[PDB]
Amino acid sequence: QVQLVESGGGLVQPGGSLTLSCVASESSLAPYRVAWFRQAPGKEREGVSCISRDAHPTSTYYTASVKGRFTMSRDNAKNTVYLQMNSLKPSDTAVYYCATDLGGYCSDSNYPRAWWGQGTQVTVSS
Amino acid sequence: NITNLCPFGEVFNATRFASVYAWNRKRISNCVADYSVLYNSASFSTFKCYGVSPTKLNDLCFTNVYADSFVIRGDEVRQIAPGQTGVIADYNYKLPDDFTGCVIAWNSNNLDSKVGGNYNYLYRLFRKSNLKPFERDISTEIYQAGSTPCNGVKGFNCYFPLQSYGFQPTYGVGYQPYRVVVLSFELLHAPATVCGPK
């Protein structure tokens, strides 16, 4: 019954930045882990980043390809999580989805996968 | 004279340490506690005491002592302190807000990591509520993370509650295994049972 709307996607040149927003409605995100995923057409869904209820760097996880470039964060007052994307590559092109579930904590291996937004397209090119 | 020395060797030098979710407790009582055995050690990553100075450990008496021990990863050792949150403090091992005692840790990468990963060490990733201080939960019930019932079986949004650290020797220092010893000191309305050397 929590509902998620990703926004902020669009056309960006290689090396540029973008901030995705995942805004939740109907429930508070505050007690729960939230994750960013991405899917390019033909290739299956993969995790980008996961933030836990304590919003501590040690319980926040990133996939190998984005480590050092992307920053996930949450503002519980706005019921919103962000993906700050810097140094964007062509290989970052995809639809970006946020997801949550009833878990308090991310692991490197286990991200939330119960409730999903419709997603936002990110295109890195000319 | 009989000087029953508290068996700190059996705690610090144990060949096997517990998974944090199944954390081990050893009662220390009716014995002389000689901490001078630790003085010339330098590879402990942390050695902090709460309500007592490390400098006075051989000069104090307690009504009871517990030695709790387990393995976690390096960047979780900060959660073994009063007033912490995170997956370990919330779901695995909880110190009281007013903790009296000491927390000692050391990197155990050499003994506890394996090429391919050590899957013997587990922690609880999912729980419906936070542990009370010194509470232990060794239950293995499947956790409902979604809207659909699990019926005691793994599946979509239905997770085994314990997860492995998979410790590998080339893990970042923050993901390497650390052995932890927590010494709990009681000062109840009862005779002292543990004193430093005369």
Place this chain on the structure above:
Amino acid sequence: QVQLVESGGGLVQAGGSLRLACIASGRTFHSYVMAWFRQAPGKEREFVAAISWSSTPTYYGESVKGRFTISRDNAKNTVYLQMNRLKPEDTAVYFCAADRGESYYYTRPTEYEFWGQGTQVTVSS
């Protein structure tokens, strides 16, 4: 949690005295071990002094023993560093630090959770 605000630093002549103060705010002050560290250009944070909850024990870096005095006012949420007979070698950024725990390894920066921004002390000749 705890915020730390240093003051009382600045410019002083070789042989002179300063008194640093750090006000700790947001949690019961007598629950915290308070410390001073100092960092010279291109150097690591070096231990200066620490003081346990009750005001005892106190600890000092070998290079400031008999010259510097750490004290705390548990009613003012303040820790002090009295610095006498200052030398050029004492020039550095001085940091207030705090932790709920008292460390056996009290000289280790990694044993203190909370850190002020630091204040410059410059001892001219």
